[PDB]
Design goal:
The structure is cut from a larger assembly and holds chains A, B and C. By secondary structure, chain A is largely without helices or strands. Chain A is built from 3 helices and 5 strands; from the N terminus they run H-H-E-E-H-E-E-E. Chain A has one domain. In chain A, strands 1-2-3-4-5 form a 5-stranded mixed beta sheet, with no helix packed on it. The longest helix of chain A is centred in the N-terminal third of the chain and has 8 residues. In chain A, about 15% of the residues are buried. In chain B, a hairpin with a 2-residue loop joins strand 17 and strand 18. In chain B, strands 7, 8, 9, 10, 11, 12, 15 and 16 form an 8-stranded antiparallel beta sheet that branches. In chain B, strands 1-2-3-4-5 form a 5-stranded mixed beta sheet, sandwiched between helices. Chain B has a two-stranded antiparallel ribbon with strand order 6-19. By secondary structure, chain B is an alpha+beta fold. In chain C, the strands form 10 sheets. Chain C has a 6-stranded mixed beta sheet with strand order 9-10-13-14-15-18. A 3-stranded antiparallel beta sheet of chain C has the order 8-7-19. In chain C, strands 24-26-25 form a 3-stranded antiparallel beta sheet, with no helix packed on it. In chain C, strand 25 and strand 26 form a beta hairpin. Classes of the chains: A little secondary structure, B alpha+beta, C alpha+beta. Chains in contact: A-C, B-C. At the B-C interface, helix 1, helix 2, helix 3, helix 6 and helix 15 of B face helix 4, strand 3, strand 24, strand 26 and helix 29 of C. Chain B binds one RNA strand through helix 12, strand 11 and strand 16. Chain A: This is Acidic leucine-rich nuclear phosphoprotein 32 family member A. Chain A: One of its GO terms (molecular function) is histone binding. Chain A: It is found in: Nucleus; Cytoplasm; Endoplasmic reticulum.
Chain lengths: ~160, ~700, ~775
RNA sequence: AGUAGAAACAAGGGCCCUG
């Protein structure tokens, strides 16, 4: 459909200030750009944008209470420093299915001191040599990677 | 979709179509109603819907599709079995469960007229359901089931869309019971006329129609009339072999005079090294004038021949004065007025202001049209042709575009042949005239468009390129700007298509003027010119042009196409008969007769007769008129007769003398026509030695 | 926005006038078309001269004003005029300008985000370029090419449609807010509309241009041209660069945009159904119609119904002609006689019976026409222009290129006209066993002789010998044909002229209706037999790919997969509107009811009993998550509802949900047993069988205006119900009335209950009753 | 003056405009 109508539909007369969860999967976003989001969303604690032909992160407003994000199936590449200012209280992030080439694009995530788990699957970076270890050495605060901690410790359900 | 049945088959199922067709045939009514009746039947079927009664048996029984005879039999059978009263009229469906009939109707208008009429006829006896295309229901009892309504109203909506699309949603195709008789609204006057336009033996459209509808063939009488008409005619048939073609007669009088705007053979030109920056017309004229060779010209008072000399001398001086000021605008003086005819346009006189006295005061009579006068064959055309078939000491005369890339062998062959022909054709003198026409007319077109009401000065020029010698000497040959002469254009206020605007042409020469040929011009000896020194002669004409001549001359480049097509029509044909690449051999070797000399037939390869073809097409562009059109359209018969003679095909004709008369009528004061006719006669003569059908 | 207010104020000003009010008030909207012509009426005699004359002027282009100001395009960049404030007299909303402006705009103007959309707009021309890039050009040669003037198609096109069907495609892919009431075509072919819609949605484009280009996209350009060699659209589009009358540019173009294999497959399928449906003597026709309707085939990505394809196609072949007849399609004026083609140029006639003794004395009646009749003919790589007269072949002029084909054409033509002594006195060999009733149906004499000639060459030689042989007179040696189809001989067949160069094919743009008999004999409003079942290959075995013969008799699968497929059809049959159904239950969040639906109870026995409980727990869980949140995948629900019958139990879930037949379904990934795609969300592929899902409720992927169209229907007008937006249609309750603007100038009433029963069946049944 | 043909042009509208 379209993020505008999809959102207006999910919001069954509810103000954009009392929700704790939101979903936008299987929609489309013009120019691969977010459209309709603002800082009004304060109580938001979860977000999911999947298979929406997305390619960048520029119109993302400031969200503090956000603590979990999902951007799978899109083609994002390069923009990963906004997270240190908009969602500094973020813990879980996932990017499997996006365009990621090198590690320099990942470095900014070090500033997310609240980061706990990260998920990188099917990306070009994964096809390198000794990559789990180099990432772990870059982001020490991290413990879980793609659902697996150092020593291949499977993470619990939730 | 040519017949109504297809249009009904577009949405209706073909079965209902066949049914309504048979029904219409039985009644004998127009077939235009196949659309309505079919719809009426389909509703009924989809009304039924295969519904059932309490006893697990069918509920609704159709009666409509059945033939008229069996309709009243089933109706009476049912009225009797269930012990019901017989109705006077017929119905469409008999609901068993409720033991009563149900009529159905369909009215396009969203109004209760049809329901009211039907109810009045049938009262309340049975159940009537008056559906509408736009969703309206009128009944006299409880409504039908929901599904029935939905299926009927959806079908009707689709049907109305598919009718409105085709312009068939009208009373014509969908009338009610009453408006079932459409007829042309015969008016009193139309009939009064039709009864007056009838042939003679008849006196009323009724008799003509009654005599025509029953007309029978009587071949005996028809043959008798045909033979009687075949006897009172005596159509002549003339085999040419017995009745030969007399030679075409050409008119008699003085030689046809030169008429093309720009001199070809005589014209003498000045060249100057190309300057890319200064490439504009006025700029080129300024550059040529500044060197000082041009400023030497100082014509004498007495011209060698011609009339109105003083005007021309004054205008030449004014042009030179103009360039020095770098403003190519001439003032309106007596000389320009007379040469340009600024004020010699007749003033319209009203008729209401007329009287016998005015007629007496100044003569008044219908214009005595002065048709053209006859001129004899020109003896100078051949010289122009021969000269135009020689090189010009330069190349690149006419502008041509570039050659695109290539991928397949075919393009390489096309590009090699085109390169060879363009190389041959860019060096002639005719092509120099092609360039001079394209450029000069382009400039004059863009002046008349921009500065009307100003007697502008435009040069007669062209651009070319010095030939390529061997690597020795100066390499990378340069370009050159040539200046054959100068033109001017009086006001080109072309309010309408195919207008008229006088122009004037000054052009140089180094040759003595013939009296017979150069009658148009008014030459002026103009000092001397280097090459050593040589006398000069300034040929000053006062011609006229239009929009159409401009546009077409600026498109004289067409000749290349026609000549190339003919040459490759000969070469591909000769190459196919042998299934091998024979083009270079054909071009180099194939000899094409191009004239006679010393009573013998000259011949030269095709490579040198392309020039002759090109001159033919160029001259067709130049001298085109009504005369040449009619001639070249009427000479084909003679050529076809020639071909018939070559192949022993016993051709024949009905009245050739009239054909020759028609031809000789359209030979007047146009050099090309007369020359071509003289050649056609010499041709038939030369062929009579090896053929027949021509008299001496 | 404010623009809306401007439009309303403009309308108000228009209505304040008197004349405009009259013309708007009276009549319908169609008058617009009429008004569209009385305005802007001006032509020019010689356009070339006018354009050249105009271009000299300082400002030869009218242009918009506000767009130029917005784009910061000044009047003069650098001492060069571009435009000047003025108003064009006719438009009154435009300003003169010059052509130079375009160059400036082209080199420093406003730039759009992406212009790759043009590749979709002109997909035909980019296809032309892509095809041209794959042509390996070999070598120009020279020779007198033999060209035959025939009608052909010059554009390779997929899914060729009619003008009526296409018009909805433009409206339903660009202007949905003003789409007309849903047609049959749009409902049937919804994958194509979705595919076109996605490319041209939320894009800055001139909509009219795209619509016109889609019109050209779906139009196979048919032309009457000279032709040489094979006949394929891939060549005809550039034939001008392959050969003329005197030259030939050899080139291999076989493997580009194959369009002949699908025509071949369609004809093979028509042959198969025609040969199947000959078993039922009494009701072959009805069986044929049912057989055609319950079959489909895949074209590229989409799956299309065979009935529509047959209507669209133009294959003038005996197989297709009969099928087109049964459906009611009109077809060309083209006869057939075995593997031969014919076309009646002129003449007439009337049936006249004559006896033929098969062996000794055995009278067999055969009908022969009685009038002069010219006929073009066409056998493989050969053609003719023969004529008949009162049971005699008057003459035949052939222009083929092969001896064998020439002989076969001559023989089949002689048979066509029932000339020769053999028709009077049958050959000794032919017997009464083969004469008739191979399967209880009589075979006329001519087809008996045709089979005889095919059986053996010697019979063919005898038949040709039957036609008199004379001595080749002088000069006519070249125009003569021996028994071996020689160009010349000393003795030759009587009145058999021969020439070089194919006989030009005639042409006629006529459409004749033709019926068919109980024995599949196609009459055409007169005696002529255009086609029959006794002019088709005997039989052959083929493995058809990407086809759907969803009919019992025409099936090879066993009872197991058929049972599962039937169960899934039944489960999808409860997806219709109305209470106590899947969509309504989902709206009421009553997932519990789904576990007791009748179709799941019927389908439960199949489920693997050993681990039925464990599977039941997983599928019973997933539905709740899908149901409660409001984010669900209809296809997964249908896939996993059969398992929700039984009581949950405890166990480990490996990943696959088995049946009792060793066939499983994994929850999420498409497999053979159950497949689908997000592109075409209106098909379910069960063991390679296409099950159409009705369009009564949208899904996250499929969600759009189309996925609900089937649910709605028209009803009796009620002015009390509300007037809603097109988008709000998703939210309306089942069995709730609502008024709605439709198309142009139509306000209707829609009720969300699906009532679209089969129309053909009811009419057929009722009409049959009229004959008792 | 001239064009061309079997009649039309050789500016036309209101001191100002135009193909």
């Amino acid at each position: 459909m379209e993020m505008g109508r999809r959102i207006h539909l999910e919001l069954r007369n509810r103000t954009p200030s009392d929700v704790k969860e939101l979903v936008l999967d299987n929609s489309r976003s013009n120019e691969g750009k977010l459209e309709g989001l603002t800082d009004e969303f304060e109580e938001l604690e979860f977000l999911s944008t999947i298979n929406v032909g997305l390619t960048s992160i520029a119109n993302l407003p400031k969200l503090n209470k956000l603590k979990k994000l999902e951007l799978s199936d899109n083609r994002v590449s390069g923009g990963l420093e906004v997270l240190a200012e908009k969602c500094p209280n973020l813990t879980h992030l996932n990017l499997s299915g996006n365009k990621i080439k090198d590690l320099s694009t990942i470095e900014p995530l070090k500033k997310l001191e609240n980061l706990k788990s990260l998920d990188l699957f099917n990306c070009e970076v994964t096809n390198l040599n000794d990559y789990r270890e180099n990432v772990f050495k870059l982001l020490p605060q991290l413990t879980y990677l793609d659902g697996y901690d150092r020593d291949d410790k499977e993470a619990p359900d939730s | 979709s040519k017949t109504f049945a297809e249009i009904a088959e577009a949405f209706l199922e073909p079965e209902a179509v066949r049914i309504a067709k048979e029904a219409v045939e039985e009644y004998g009514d127009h077939e235009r109603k196949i659309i309505q009746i079919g719809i009426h039947f389909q509703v009924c079927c989809m009304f039924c819907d295969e519904y059932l009664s309490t006893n697990g048996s069918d509920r609704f029984v159709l009666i409509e599709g059945r033939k008229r005879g069996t309709a009243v039999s089933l109706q009476n059978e049912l009225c009797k079995s269930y012990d019901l009263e017989p109705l006077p009229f017929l119905c469409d469906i008999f609901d068993r469960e409720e033991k009563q009939f149900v009529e159905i109707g369909i009215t396009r208008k969203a109004d209760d007229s049809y329901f009211q009429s039907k109810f009045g006829k049938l009262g309340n006896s049975c159940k009537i359901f008056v559906f509408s295309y736009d969703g309206r229901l009128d009944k006299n009892c409880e409504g039908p089931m929901e599904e029935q309504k939905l299926r009927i109203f959806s079908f009707l909506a689709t049907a109305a869309d598919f009718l409105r699309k085709e312009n068939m949603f009208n009373e014509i195709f969908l009338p009610d019971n009453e408006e079932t008789i459409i007829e042309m609204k015969k008016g009193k006057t139309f009939l009064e006329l039709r009864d007056e336009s009838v042939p003679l033996p008849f006196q009323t459209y009724e008799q003509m129609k009654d005599y025509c509808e029953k007309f029978k063939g009587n071949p005996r009488e028809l043959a008798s009339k045909v033979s009687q008409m075949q006897s009172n005619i005596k159509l002549p048939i003339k085999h040419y072999e017995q009745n030969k073609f007399r030679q075409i007669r050409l008119p008699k009088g003085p030689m046809a005079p030169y008429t093309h705007k720009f001199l070809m053979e005589e014209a003498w030109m000045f060249t100057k090294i190309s300057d890319p920056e200064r490439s504009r017309a006025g700029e080129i004229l300024i550059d040529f004038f500044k060197k000082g060779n041009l400023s030497a010209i100082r014509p004498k008072d007495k011209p060698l021949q011609g009339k109105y000399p003083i005007h021309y001398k004054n205008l030449w001086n004014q042009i030179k004065a103009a360039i020095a000021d770098r403003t190519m605008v001439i003032n309106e003086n007596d000389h320009s007025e007379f040469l340009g005819g600024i004020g010699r346009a007749s003033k319209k006189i009203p008729e209401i202001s007329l009287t016998q006295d005015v007629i007496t005061t100044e003569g008044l009579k219908q214009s005595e049209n002065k048709l053209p006068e006859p001129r004899s064959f020109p003896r100078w055309f051949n010289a122009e042709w021969m000269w135009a078939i020689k090189d010009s000491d330069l190349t690149g005369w006419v502008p041509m575009a570039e050659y695109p890339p290539a991928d397949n062998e075919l393009e390489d062959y096309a590009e090699h042949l085109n390169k060879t022909m363009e190389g041959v054709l860019q060096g002639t003198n005719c092509a120099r005239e092609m360039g001079k026409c394209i450029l000069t007319v382009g400039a004059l077109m863009t002046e008349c468009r921009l500065f009307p009401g100003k007697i502008k000065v435009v040069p007669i020029y062209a651009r070319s390129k010095e030939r390529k010698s061997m690597q020795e000497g100066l390499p990378v040959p340069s370009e050159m700007d040539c200046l054959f002469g100068i033109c001017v254009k009086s006001k080109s206020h072309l309010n309408k298509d195919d207008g008229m605007y006088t122009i004037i042409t000054f052009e140089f020469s180094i040759r003595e003027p013939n009296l017979e040929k150069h009658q148009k011009y008014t030459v002026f000896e103009a000092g001397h010119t280097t090459v050593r020194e040589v006398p000069l002669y300034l040929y000053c004409r006062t011609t006229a042009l239009s929009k159409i001549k401009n546009d077409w001359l600026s498109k004289a480049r067409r000749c290349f196409i026609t000549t190339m097509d003919t040459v490759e029509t000969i070469c591909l044909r000769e190459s196919a008969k042998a299934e091998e690449n024979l083009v270079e051999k054909t071009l180099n070797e194939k000899q094409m007769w191009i004239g006679k000399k010393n009573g013998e037939l000259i011949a030269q390869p095709l490579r040198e007769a392309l020039r002759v073809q090109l001159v033919q097409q160029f001259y067709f562009c130049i001298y085109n008129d009504s005369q040449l059109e009619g001639f070249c359209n009427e000479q084909k018969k003679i050529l076809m007769a020639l071909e018939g003679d070559k192949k022993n095909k016993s051709s024949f004709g009905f009245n050739p003398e009239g054909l020759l008369e028609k031809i000789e009528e359209c030979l007047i004061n146009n050099p090309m026509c007369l020359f071509m006719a003289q050649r056609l006669n010499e041709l038939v003569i030369e062929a009579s030695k090896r053929g027949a059908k021509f008299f001496k | 926005m404010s623009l809306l207010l401007t439009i309303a104020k403009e309308y108000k000003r228009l209505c304040q006038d008197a004349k405009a009010a009259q013309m708007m008030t009276v009549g319908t909207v169609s008058n617009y078309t009429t008004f569209k012509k009385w305005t802007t009426s001006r032509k020019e005699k010689n356009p070339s001269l006018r354009m050249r004359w105009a271009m000299s002027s300082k400002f030869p282009i009218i242009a918009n004003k506000r767009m130029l100001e917005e784009a910061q395009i000044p009047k003069e960049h650098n001492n060069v005029a571009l435009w000047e404030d003025t108003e064009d007299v006719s438009k009154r909303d435009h300003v003169l300008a010059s052509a130079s402006c375009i160059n400036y705009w082209n080199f420093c103007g406003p730039c759009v985000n992406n212009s790759e959309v043009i590749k979709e707009v002109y997909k035909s021309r980019f296809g032309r370029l892509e095809r041209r890039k794959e042509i390996m050009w070999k070598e120009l040669r020279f020779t007198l090419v033999d060209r035959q003037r025939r009608r052909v198609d010059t554009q390779p096109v997929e899914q060729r449609l009619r003008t009526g069907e296409i018009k909805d495609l433009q409206m339903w892919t660009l202007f949905e807010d003003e789409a007309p009431l849903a047609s049959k075509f749009i409902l049937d072919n919804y994958g194509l509309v979705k595919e076109m819609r996605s490319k041209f949605a939320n894009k800055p484009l001139n909509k009219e241009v795209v619509a016109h280009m889609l019109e050209k996209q779906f139009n196979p350009e048919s032309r009457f041209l000279p032709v040489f060699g094979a006949i394929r659209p891939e060549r005809m589009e550039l034939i001008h660069a392959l050969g003329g009358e005197t030259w030939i540019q050899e080139a291999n173009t076989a493997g580009i945009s194959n369009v002949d294999q699908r025509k071949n497959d369609i004809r093979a399928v028509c042959r198969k159904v025609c040969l199947a449906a000959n078993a039922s003597i009494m009701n072959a026709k009805s069986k044929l119609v049912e057989y055609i309707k319950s079959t489909s085939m895949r074209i590229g990505e989409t799956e299309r119904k065979l009935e529509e394809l047959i209507l669209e196609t133009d294959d003038v072949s005996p197989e297709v002609t009969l099928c087109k007849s049964a459906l009611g399609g009109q077809l060309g004026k083209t006869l057939s006689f075995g593997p031969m083609l014919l076309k009646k140029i002129s003449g007439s006639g009337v049936k006249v019976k004559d006896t033929v003794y098969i062996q000794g004395v055995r009278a067999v009646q055969f009908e022969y026409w009685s009038e002069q009749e010219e006929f073009y003919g066409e056998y493989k790589s050969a053609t003719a222009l023969f004529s008949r007269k009162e049971r005699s072949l008057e003459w035949i002029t052939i222009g083929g290129g092969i001896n064998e084909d020439r002989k076969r054409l001559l023989a089949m033509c002689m048979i066509f006209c029932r000339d020769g002594d053999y028709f009077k006195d049958a050959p000794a060999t032919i017997t009464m066993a083969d004469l008739s009733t191979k399967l209880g149906r009589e075979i006329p004499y001519q087809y008996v002789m045709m089979n005889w000639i095919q059986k053996s060459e010697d019979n063919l030689e005898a038949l040709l010998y039957s036609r008199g042989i004379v001595e080749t007179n002088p000069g006519k040696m070249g125009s003569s044909m021996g028994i071996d189809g020689s160009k010349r001989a000393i003795k030759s067949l009587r009145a058999v002229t021969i020439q070089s160069g194919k006989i030009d094919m005639p042409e006629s743009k006529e459409k004749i209706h033709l019926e068919l008999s109980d024995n599949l004999e196609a009459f055409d409003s007169s005696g002529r037999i255009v086609a029959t079942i006794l002019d088709l290959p005997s039989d052959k075995k083929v493995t058809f790919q990407d086809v759907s013969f969803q009919h019992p008799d025409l099936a090879v699968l066993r009872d197991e997969k058929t049972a599962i497929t039937k169960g899934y059809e039944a489960l999808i049959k409860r997806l219709g509107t109305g209470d106590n159904d899947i969509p309504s239950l989902i709206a009421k969040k009553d997932y519990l009811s789904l576990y007791n639906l009748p179709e799941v109870k019927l389908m439960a026995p199949l489920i693997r009993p050993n681990r039925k409980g464990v599977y039941s727990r997983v599928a019973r869980k997933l539905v709740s998550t899908q149901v409660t949140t409001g984010h669900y995948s209809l296809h997964e629900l249908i896939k996993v509802l059969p398992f929700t019958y039984f009581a949950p139990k405890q166990g480990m879930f490996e990943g696959r949900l088995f049946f009792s037949n060793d066939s499983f379904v994994e929850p999420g990934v498409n497999n053979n047993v159950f497949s689908w795609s997000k592109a075409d969300s209106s098909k379910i592929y069960c063991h390679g069988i296409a099950i159409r899902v009705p369009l009564v409720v949208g899904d996250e992927h499929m969600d759009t205006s189309l996925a609900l169209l089937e649910g709605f229907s028209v009803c009796e007008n009620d002015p009390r119900a509300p007037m809603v937006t097109r988008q709000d249609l998703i939210d309306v309750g089942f069995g709730q009335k609502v008024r709605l603007f439709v198309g142009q100038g139509s306000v209707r009433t829609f009720k969300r209950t699906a009532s679209q029963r089969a129309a053909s069946s009811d009419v057929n049944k009722n009409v049959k009753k009229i004959k008792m």
